[PDB]
Amino acid sequence: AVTPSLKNFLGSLIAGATVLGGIALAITAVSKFDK
Amino acid sequence: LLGVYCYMGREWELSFRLGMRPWIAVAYSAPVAAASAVFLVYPIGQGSFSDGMPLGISGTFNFMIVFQAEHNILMHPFHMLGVAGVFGGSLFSAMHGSLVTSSLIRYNIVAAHGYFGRLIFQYASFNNSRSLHFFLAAWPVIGIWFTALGLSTMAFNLNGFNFNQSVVDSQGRVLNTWADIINRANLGMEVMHERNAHN
Amino acid sequence: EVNIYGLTATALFIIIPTSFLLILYVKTAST
Amino acid sequence: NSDFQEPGLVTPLGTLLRPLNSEAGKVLPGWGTTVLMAVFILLFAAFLLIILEIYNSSLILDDVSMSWETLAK
Amino acid sequence: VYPIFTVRWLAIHGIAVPTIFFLGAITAMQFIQR
Amino acid sequence: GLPWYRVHTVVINDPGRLISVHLMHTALVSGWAGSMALFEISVFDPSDPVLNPMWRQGMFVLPFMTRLGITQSWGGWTISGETATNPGIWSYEGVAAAHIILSGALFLASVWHWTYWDLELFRDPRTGKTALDLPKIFGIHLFLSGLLCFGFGAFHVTGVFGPGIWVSDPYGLTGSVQPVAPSWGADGFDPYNPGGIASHHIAAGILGVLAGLFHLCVRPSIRLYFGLSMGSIETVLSSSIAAVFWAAFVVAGTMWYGSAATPIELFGPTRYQWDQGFFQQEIQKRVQASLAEGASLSDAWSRIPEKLAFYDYIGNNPAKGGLFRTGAMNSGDGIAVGWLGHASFKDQEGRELFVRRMPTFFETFPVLLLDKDGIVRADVPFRKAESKYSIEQVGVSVTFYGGELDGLTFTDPATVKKYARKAQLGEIFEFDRSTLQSDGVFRSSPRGWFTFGHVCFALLFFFGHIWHGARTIFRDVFAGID
Amino acid sequence: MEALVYTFLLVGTLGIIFFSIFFRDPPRMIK
Amino acid sequence: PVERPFSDILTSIRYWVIHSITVPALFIAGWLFVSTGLAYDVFGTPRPNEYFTEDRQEAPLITDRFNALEQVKKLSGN
Amino acid sequence: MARPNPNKQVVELNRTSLYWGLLLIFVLAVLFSSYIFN
Amino acid sequence: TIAIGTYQEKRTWFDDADDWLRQDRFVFVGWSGLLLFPCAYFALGGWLTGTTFVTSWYTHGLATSYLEGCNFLTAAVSTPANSMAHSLLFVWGPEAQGDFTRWCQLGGLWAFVALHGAFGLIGFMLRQFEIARSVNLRPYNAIAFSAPIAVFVSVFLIYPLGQSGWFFAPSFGVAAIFRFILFFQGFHNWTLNPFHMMGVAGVLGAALLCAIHGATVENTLFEDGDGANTFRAFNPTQAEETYSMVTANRFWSQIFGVAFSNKRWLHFFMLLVPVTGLWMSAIGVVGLALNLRAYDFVSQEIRAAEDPEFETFYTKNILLNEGIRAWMAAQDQPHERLVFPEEVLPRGNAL
Amino acid sequence: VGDVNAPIEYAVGAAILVSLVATAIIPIVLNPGQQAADKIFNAK
Ligand code: CLA
Ligand code: CLA
Ligand code: CLA
Ligand code: CLA
Ligand SMILES: CC(C)=CCC/C(C)=C/CC/C(C)=C/CC/C(C)=C/CC/C(C)=C/CC/C(C)=C/CC/C(C)=C/CC/C(C)=C/CC/C(C)=C/CC1=CC(=O)C(C)=C(C)C1=O
Ligand SMILES: CCCCCCCCCCCCCCCC(=O)OC[C@H](COP(=O)(O)OC[C@@H](O)CO)OC(=O)CCCCCCCCCCCCCCC
Ligand SMILES: CC1=C(/C=C/C(C)=C/C=C/C(C)=C/C=C/C=C(C)/C=C/C=C(C)/C=C/C2=C(C)CCCC2(C)C)C(C)(C)CCC1
Ligand SMILES: CC1=C(/C=C/C(C)=C/C=C/C(C)=C/C=C/C=C(C)/C=C/C=C(C)/C=C/C2=C(C)CCCC2(C)C)C(C)(C)CCC1
Ligand SMILES: CC1=C(C)C(=O)C(CC[C@](C)(O)CCC[C@H](C)CCC[C@H](C)CCCC(C)C)=C(C)C1=O
Ligand SMILES: [Fe+2]
């Protein structure tokens, strides 16, 4: 069964993926604007 | 003590006999001041030579422990300045050695300055090769002077800081802080040291 | 003879590096 | 030097194993297959995190008991 | 010279805003009767 | 004119000399393994496997051999205390002799490869210069390692062809070598489940093979080829150093915290079992169950095995020891010879008292007899100090249940004080101190020595990784060229 | 036995110090 | 594209117009944050009169890992 | 017995290095002898 | 054959990202910046927030915050309680369950700061490597920083990992660090361990070298300026060195007995001393983490116990350690629930 | 209990004094650094 701790862990995985994607998008957009 | 003072004098004497500038004795005054303090001024303030530092290793450790028991040296500002001086001296020695060794290629200050200015920001701080070495010579010496003066002041027994029972809630109850744990350690140390009942 | 193992350890630690360094110095000084 | 100072010794095993040590320095154009490596690295990191949390009691799973008592299965 | 919202702007503001907030908080804490 | 610390770099180009050097190092390590096996077997005493196991005698390599199936010996004894009749080829002495022979053969191969350095195998057809195809070599070696891992997992650990591995009950009371069936569910990831081992050595094994195949059929991209300096032979050194760094921390952690691959019956108990009252709680539960079932206190306390009481003794805690307290644990506090029995203290009023057990941190701890409510009720002065509650005044008495001193009682304050100071350490035992001339200071078990050594090596290897990686990335600057 | 070892080690250290002070190779590299 | 010198902004009018009305807002925000009592609620720091609960007259102790939330809620009196 | 290896240098150790090594070993022995003897 | 050089292919997103990151601005971001700046920023923010608002009432029974009335020397970010043995204390973990107030109360802020700070140190080392590679200099600053990172890793992660839990790691503060130092002096006799001795020697020698080198260089300058001050008689584009090596060498060869004759060797010795000292200290604390302490000198203990009339400073140090432990464990370890009656507390009156 | 004695009048009075003393000296400390960084940059 999906224990609450496992649900929280999957949520943390999603949040980390979101943070990394945000950083990547920021660098990409800024580089494209400047070049 | 007489030997170290005359060594101090001989440093200047030889510096003068060679054409050098005479300000190495000033740098040497720091360790001499600390040694003179510990070995002569503390016993005078306390009133006996039994309070001097035994010439050994375990003797030095017992010396330090007895101070931490009696005068609370760790919280004295001058000891903080001494610790800062020693740590900063180690840091500056290591980092100056690293930059100078890296720069020297089969440029000494104009090349590594580009590295330093962008590493931790702080552009155009020590761009003069002489000011940098003067700063190196000045930091630890001042630190040791301050710590020696702190020990000398403790000889006449003012004290380190004292924050015991500095936090109290309503109704007058006392809430413990880290200073209280340090004070408990000091109290145990002092109780252990004193013999009181001596036969 | 107390702590024979300690005495042997001290003797080895004082001899082996010393002999190695001295042999290296004599070998290189011939150059 | 000529052919790195004349040819070396030849042995039957050397001749047999020569093919495995011939194409030195060959490479593919572009980035090749780095994206697959990145995906696999991410999966491995997730697996390492999962095991680390399982062994640290930060991720309690129904089946695992996480104690010496599991030896009495 | 013209554009703003650069790296320097973000870097300085990030450490500037919380500093002012915490300075105000501590100054207010000073005047508590305990 | 190479300095003393740049001497071996002369082998940085020719592969044959590198092969010979690696063979020499392998021979040295194999010879060390054989010699230590022989020495430990010569020093081992197999008389008592209950109160004198391996971990009490300072053994280091013997449990590793025993962990994988080696039990019997050529002298007629077994690690379980029984007697062997057919030791066979594979015993302790056989393993040591085999390792020594391998060391010698590797030494001969090393000298041969050192003599014949210039082989055609080390020169590529184009440009006629020495070169190594590192990606393909890595593919071959990884393929081989994965195949070996699969073989070990599916033939030895699972017991289909081999002997199996050491498995024991949770309390380390009855263990032996058995086959281990794989476990695939989520229960195969907790390190205290032996099955999780076998499955891994299968699963990862397969992956290994697959990986190797890929690495033999796909050449690296140019950008990756130049970014990681894959044409140099120092990048691989940094990667390997980092890998062993990581593995050293993994193994040291699993040894310290306990796992299914480090049974307490071979290396000794961990400190976290003493801290959490594992064996104490188990014994208390068993005795309470016996009393509830209906029986006398003496009978209830006389049924617990001596091994279980031995595990509950702070002298066995690996935490307490010294860096320079050399030797085996058996030379620290004497060789155990018997179990006196559980000591119960009762005062004049009648309520039972218990002794506050000594935490791990405290080198010396006062004795405090305190009742069930947690309030101190008796104690001993520090050293000739004024006393308000004292063993003499309160008049506590000690009774012994089970063990050798069964049914006896004592009232003399001296004996009561001595037994209280003995009980503050845990279960009271009898120690022969005249054979090894034990000083009286506790020593650490093999667990602590292993963890300490491997952690120190891991940190030094972290520094080595940093240095060699920096020297690889900065090749041109270091060499003073473009 | 321990006292003799300690005295020997201290004497050796002092002897190395003296030899370094008085029998050093000349510093002609930069002078 | 040259990271205008700090001197240029120092003499600007819009810079001062913005900052002289913005910074005081942050300072007052902090003052009200720690004055209204929001800090105690947000960060869980007990008030001077909430240290010792009616039924407890000593420092608290968690003594529990997987039920630490309920333990802390009970000890704090909330 | 096949061909002289071109990569063959010789180690060199000036006197200052020897003095440093002797000082290091003797100082370490002084520091650690008491602990070894207990 | 089809040969190839470097960067002879079409441009890619990676190329644009690399070009933007490695520009020339007031702050050098670089690739390591992505890992350094966020982590360090959050570490500093967490420390300040913990020292300003959060308290340790429910973990250690203390009051450490400006909101509670503590000075800069007594405020700190206390470690989590001993019950939380080695949990990483995530906000979403089984302990906090997602409540920020309870997360702060239990003490996860310490773990937050420690982890993000360790990753910040890693990022800083990578930044130094990147700068050195960009400006084409050998990376010695990398090792010089590898020393302190090793010390931090040891003290703040390996020591607690061997003990009961995070409760015994340092708390980020001044009085907390003093408590830590006294705690080792009491329980481990850390002052008698050879490794701390070597570290002390290394640090003091580093300070000595710094001071002496500065004094010698500043007192042997060449006459290249009419003004009374020698600071303005120099420019960064000088060709020769500003001080006479021969004069300093002779001076220190006639005063002390041995003097340097090589700039590279001198500055390399400066680099070498402190790194070795701190590495040895780190190894010593790694050993201590397993309670492998140099405490016994068993012969002296046996001799002292045999007859009371034999006292050395070592025995007095042992007694002082006993006093420290007995008198401080009462409140230093609340989870043990220790209550020592005044009869049993060690005191010099009873010897 | 734990309320602030001082009123908001002093809050604003001190805000004005500690807000216009920090927004005008943060660019004066960095000016040397920004002036020297450009000299270092675009040179080597
Ligand atoms: C580069 C910057 C950086 C770094 C290195 C870290 C690192 C860390 N943070 Mg910090 N943090 C950051 C930025 C960063 N953070 C930012 C920007 C914020 C604000 C949003 C935070 C806010 C924050 C909080 C509030 C907390 C942390 C915590 C942590 C720690 C736990 C890491 C973890 O499990 O997270 C998650 C990490 C990952 C998910 C790794 C990435 C792996 C990806 C997702 C793989 C995906 C592949 C695939 C889809 C997965 C398949 C499996 C499954 C889905 C089927 C760790 C030390 C926690 C901690 O330890 O505090 C005590 C904590 O409580 N951080
Ligand atoms: C990491 C590997 C490792 C580990 C964990 C152990 C662990 C153990 N060994 Mg084994 N051993 C090893 C490697 C290892 N050994 C190797 C490589 C050899 C070959 C020489 C041996 C040879 C060996 C023998 C012959 C014996 C042991 C014994 C022991 C036990 C006693 C404790 C001990 O080692 O002494 C305590 C450790 C120390 C005092 C070392 C202190 C470490 C410091 C940091 C070193 C400092 C060095 C310093 C820089 C220079 C000082 C110079 C000074 C001496 C003058 C213990 C189970 C004994 C035993 O019980 O067997 C039954 C025994 O008789 N071992
Ligand atoms: C896989 C492991 C590995 C390998 C193959 C190498 C190989 C090499 N290293 Mg690296 N290194 C390693 C690990 C390794 N190292 C680690 C872990 C560290 C951190 C301590 C270093 C730190 C290091 C430095 C700082 C330098 C090298 C250098 C070198 C080269 C010359 C060897 C040397 O030092 O002269 C031979 C050395 C000696 C003869 C001295 C031996 C005396 C030792 C110190 C004491 C006795 C050791 C004992 C008997 C055995 C210990 C066993 C233990 C490992 C279990 C060579 C290419 C040097 C080089 O060429 O780079 C420019 C160099 O400057 N290495
Ligand atoms: C003469 C007296 C003396 C001296 C010189 C030393 C010397 C030393 N002791 Mg001490 N010690 C002594 C007496 C002494 N000891 C006594 C009598 C005791 C009682 C037992 C102790 C107890 C003691 C303990 C308990 C410890 C030491 C440690 C150390 C070492 C400190 C290493 C260091 O700098 O780490 C400090 C540096 C770091 C941790 C690096 C962190 C740097 C980060 C990345 C910076 C963060 C950025 C920051 C926010 C920027 C702000 C900058 C701002 C401050 C300006 C050093 C060798 C420590 C040690 O090294 O052990 C391994 C240690 O743990 N000693
Ligand atoms: C009965 C008796 C004898 C009693 C003795 C009892 C007893 C206590 C014995 C002593 C025991 C003992 C030796 C204890 C110490 C043991 C100990 C802790 C060892 C530590 C060893 C160790 C490996 C530590 C690691 C760190 C380490 C390597 C430290 C090195 C320390 C060190 C040598 C520092 C340098 C000291 C020093 C004085 C340097 C001065 C250098 C110098 C002359 C520069 C001058 C100079 C400046 C210029 O600017 C220029 C230009 C020139 C040209 C120039 O020259
Ligand atoms: C996508 C996230 C966007 C930002 C969110 C706000 C960030 C600021 C948080 C301040 C604290 C407030 C409390 C939040 C905490 C909170 O409220 O969590 C709550 C949330 C859900 O829990 P529940 O409240 O549903 O649980 C209740 C019960 O069911 C529990 O049994 O937990 C998660 O799913 C993970 C959330 C992560 C949020 C942190 C984001 C960062 C993740 C780590 C990133 C690592 C990057 C590594 C790169 C290599
Ligand atoms: C040839 C041969 C043979 C034989 C052989 C043999 C018998 C061998 C042996 C060998 C051996 C017998 C070897 C040994 C080795 C050893 C070693 C190699 C050791 C090492 C050690 C070490 C390395 C240590 C270290 C350390 C210490 C001391 C402690 C701690 C610290 C340290 C780590 C530093 C025959 C005739 C049969 C046949 C044919 C072949
Ligand atoms: C919440 C949190 C977070 C974050 C945070 C942060 C990011 C923070 C920051 C913070 C900060 C950023 C802070 C700052 C502060 C500052 C301060 C607090 C300052 C102070 C100062 C002072 C006090 C000064 C003084 C002085 C001077 C210098 C002048 C004159 C003289 C004197 C001495 C008076 C997160 C979500 C991630 C997670 C959870 C937690
Ligand atoms: C020419 C030009 C320059 C010089 C410039 O700085 C910008 C702003 C980009 C950005 C907002 O800084 C983007 C910052 C986002 C960044 C990628 C997030 C990750 C890295 C760090 C967290 C950034 C903060 C570092 C700072 C604290 C030193 C633009 C749009 C331009 O056109
Ligand atoms: Fe210099």
Author numbering:
A (entry chain X): 64 to 98
B (entry chain A): 120 to 225, 246 to 338
C (entry chain M): 2 to 32
D (entry chain H): 14 to 86
E (entry chain F): 11 to 44
F (entry chain B): 2 to 483
G (entry chain T): 1 to 31
H (entry chain E): 5 to 82
List sentences quoted exactly from the publication behind this structure:
Photosystem II (PSII) catalyzes water oxidation and plastoquinone reduction by utilizing light energy. It is highly susceptible to photodamage under high-light conditions and the damaged PSII needs to be restored through a process known as the PSII repair cycle. Here, we report biochemical and structural features of a PSII-repair intermediate complex, likely arrested at an early stage of the PSII repair process in the green alga Chlamydomonas reinhardtii.
In the high-light treated prf2 mutant cells, the PSII-M complex contains a small single-transmembrane-helix protein binding to Cyt b559 in a way resembling that of PRF2 as revealed by the cryo-EM structure. Especially, the membrane-spanning regions of PRF2 and PRF2’ are highly similar. When PRF2’ is associated with the PSII core, it induces conformational changes on the DE-loop region of D1 protein in a way similar to the one with PRF2 associated. Taken together, we suggest that PRF2’ may be a redundant homolog of PRF2 functioning in a similar way to inhibit electron transport on the acceptor side of PSII during the PSII repair process.
